[PDB]
Point group: D3
């Protein structure tokens, strides 16, 4: 089974990486789909961070996409969408998108994986807010992201 | 009983229409109140969509309003506000507005109606996002809205 | 419009009474349906409490019922079910019953009314627990209920 | 991938069957695990209902189990647990079990699938309550379950 | 114990004041931290409102801050953060910040206090929206805020 | 400040202990109140587990109580109730009790502390269920509890 893990990943956090690692162990192939269209990092920068952070996972690929997610899924020939859930995640929103995507692409399923408990409260938005003020986010994001934040924010 | 169903309806979805149809069957009179003040459709366009989509309901009228909803309710002489609820709807926000409106207009009640299960995950925001990228939203919105989206987005 | 407000009301609390009073002001007729089948009070005792507590509302009647609520609704010729909502109420459960009842009795709607903010945290279960240990529940329940609790618990 | 779908299924509803059908299409093998230990139906009766209702799915097997679910998963050599989610489901409880099971069986993942919107409000408990009073549950459960309910309740 | 109650307080509502009053009675010292960085009121105006509204509480001080809240907490030598909770409050968001702050400032706890039931549905955003259209918010905010709103909105 | 941490603690889990440890560091005195009245462990056994597990905390005492919690609080002369919150905890129920207790004991506050993220999904009920079937709960409960479970369940 080939699954697609979509998101803006601005930037990639340990929560995202944890879900990617779990999907990597479960499925034959995982494609991380990076949304491209105000993000802190460009689509290219976000993709580069992901390629560096997932280099150790042999069955994980990554690419940017524009337009409808279901069209990307069809384009890469995947069987399902995978998303991570956190005790904090917007349950309603994920359910809504999952149902809508299953209508746009008749029968396309979204499978939810539970992110590691230790990263239950990590979000890209909070990482950026903390980093912006010089806060230490080293335990919340992978090394590739930490380096990118320091370069971007000039810290 | 005369009830008012308020909203921005940008644009009207099948979820909204379903609630309007239920209110039409329950109450003697229903007035759909269209908020006017960045919306995709102008207040006039949103009102026109509603008039076309509800033409089959003899006791349903529609009008735009600015300012406080409670002042519009008093203006048209309605007895209550009616709102639709979805297993996804922002329960907290609706409860908050209902309580505040009951204070602004002493004793003015808001009655909640459950939208059809089949439209539980439809929202104007998602309809616009999907339509913007050429996605098929024909099963999510009434014909009047579908026509308006194609003309607006030039599709 | 004739509406039915169902419940076990074991015993009737100020939250229940508040909703009954709001329904009384909104609708032409309100019938409080008392479920009869381990309750602290018998169906007869629960009905008596309700008749005493709602005596001041001219358009409110009360009766016990067994079996399906929808059959009682049809029996008394009501147009809808009314239920109260609290920021604490089991939103999911009420939504579930509302949808199921709308299927059992094709098109039968349930209208939700918001209970007074001051009684947002009152429930029959907590009233009984507090009263059982001699706690003062006088501000949480109507006089009829207070008298019944003192007699039942021998306080 | 071989997945296990656990539950008490007392009795199997259309919500359960829908999830089983989705899992059947996604995974190579699906084993429905029936909990055996006050249920309305015996473990044998519940298993029989499932075997009849899933007969059309070639890659779906079913069996009863006692003790820890993770031990059953290991016993049948499955790679993950699959559970269905409904906009009403006890999100917290499912998350809790998923995390605990991932600890008991190091790394064992639970994948969540979204049940069909039309069965979002169906639960075994409500089916039994409605059927007990002669209510029509034919649209809420599969034929095998309908027959079992009529025989059990003598209707 | 010295606690810090942070927020934007744009403007201070009765919900905020209620929590401040409760914290004042519980702890030896309370410092209200006003976030400074599009707010309706300037940081100076927001601080002035708070100083006027809390003048009756002898152990309550107030100051503006920029950057990380944890740095302000350390700066004033406080032992914990205190936040108010409402049956409507974004539980998830408060939990997220509490956990993140406990990581940034190793072991720094956030203590949650329940706001008065009567102000359970009051928020700065809704106060501003209502006041903007000439609605009466006198029962939702303290006198200092009412005066500031009339001057700011020229009402 | 002297605070009371109430519960049935049947048995004490790492989630409970974590909250007790946090309260111990924050407040001058902490009294763990053990509810006594079908529990797996007797009130005496539950209290013994707590005394052993909290022996390292010099300002923590423990005692059993019957009747109303507010009466126990008054009896020991405490200033507030402290409770732990988990992203899974029944938010509504805790809010309800906090409000009711603040009415029974005019002004008695309940302060909520966030349990460690790592124990976010641990509950006494699940510990007992897992232990009953021979599951390893050593990482979910303190040594005192592990020993008590083995003796009670004869494992
Ligand atoms: C990128 C994402 C998966 C959400 O990512 P996020 O959780 O990082 O904000 C979603 O916005 C998306 O799928 N966008 C592509 C447009 C689309 O397909 N929209 C219809 C969704 S039903
Ligand atoms: C239009 C609406 C009903 C919300 O509509 P929405 O759900 O489509 O966003 C609400 O914004 C409104 O009532 N606006 C008028 C201003 C007002 O009365 N505000 C006070 C609300 S308590
Ligand atoms: C009595 C009540 C309204 C719930 O009352 P409660 O909130 O006081 O517990 C509900 O149990 C009911 O309607 N019972 C009658 C049986 C029935 O119709 N069941 C199907 C519900 S979909
Ligand atoms: C049967 C079920 C999946 C829950 O089923 P339900 O949703 O039908 O009530 C759960 O109770 C279970 O896994 N029971 C076996 C005992 C066990 O493994 N318990 C630990 C759960 S973390
Ligand atoms: C001001 C506030 C407490 C939130 O206030 P609000 O609820 O009024 O919007 C929060 O934004 C904050 O602490 N800001 C300072 C920046 C910071 O410390 N961010 C990290 C939060 S984990
Ligand atoms: C023991 C407890 C704190 C709840 O404990 P739990 O979360 O372990 O189930 C609660 O049941 C309690 O306070 N019981 C004493 C009786 C009482 O005071 N009841 C009124 C509560 S408002």
């Amino acid at each position: 089974m080939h699954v697609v893990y979509p998101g803006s990943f601005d930037p990639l956090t340990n929560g995202h990486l944890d879900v990617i690692q779990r999907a990597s162990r479960l499925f034959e192939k995982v494609t991380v789909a990076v949304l491209e269209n105000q993000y802190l990092f460009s689509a290219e920068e976000r993709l580069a961070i992901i390629r560096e952070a997932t280099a150790h996972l042999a069955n994980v690929e990554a690419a940017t996409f524009s337009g409808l997610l279901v069209d990307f899924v069809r384009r890469v020939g995947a069987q399902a969408i995978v998303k991570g859930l956190r005790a904090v995640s917007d349950y309603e929103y994920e359910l809504q998108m999952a149902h809508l995507n299953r209508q746009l692409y008749p029968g396309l399923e979204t499978l939810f994986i539970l992110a590691a408990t230790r990263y239950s409260f990590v979000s890209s938005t909070m990482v950026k807010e903390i980093a912006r003020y010089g806060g230490d986010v080293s335990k919340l994001v992978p090394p590739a992201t930490l380096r990118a934040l320091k370069a971007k924010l000039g810290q």
